[PDB]
Amino acid sequence: MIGSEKQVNWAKSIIEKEVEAWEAIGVDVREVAAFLRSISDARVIIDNRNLIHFQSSGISYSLESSPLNSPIFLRRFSACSVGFEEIPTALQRIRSVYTAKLLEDE
């Protein structure tokens, strides 16, 4: 970790917040949480703080965008991350499984 110590602590709180949003919004995503936790650069979270902002209540819209499946965003995290190459795959399953529930409920 490079930077002020207080910054690191602040960044950690951001990660926890993001984790709760992902689990609560649609479904529990352990892999997603691991990615944020694996972040070794605190400054990265702050810079991407606006990116992790919560969008409209319409989760369907957010799912379509799938920011986590962005090659550009993911590129920056290429230097440091965990399961990043497998992140897009796991996420696809989430949208895939989420819609499955809808079909089941008629």
Helix, strand, or coil (residue 85)? coil
Q: By C-alpha distance, which of 36, 68, 43, 45 is closest to 55?
A: 68
CA dist., res. 106 & res. 102, Å (int): 7
The first and second tokens of residue 77, run together, are 């995290």
Which domain, by its residues, includes 55?
Answer: 5-104
State the chain's maximal CA–CA distance in angstroms: 53
Place of tokens 């930077």: 3
Check if the beta carbon of residue 39 is closer than 8 Å to that of residue 15: yes
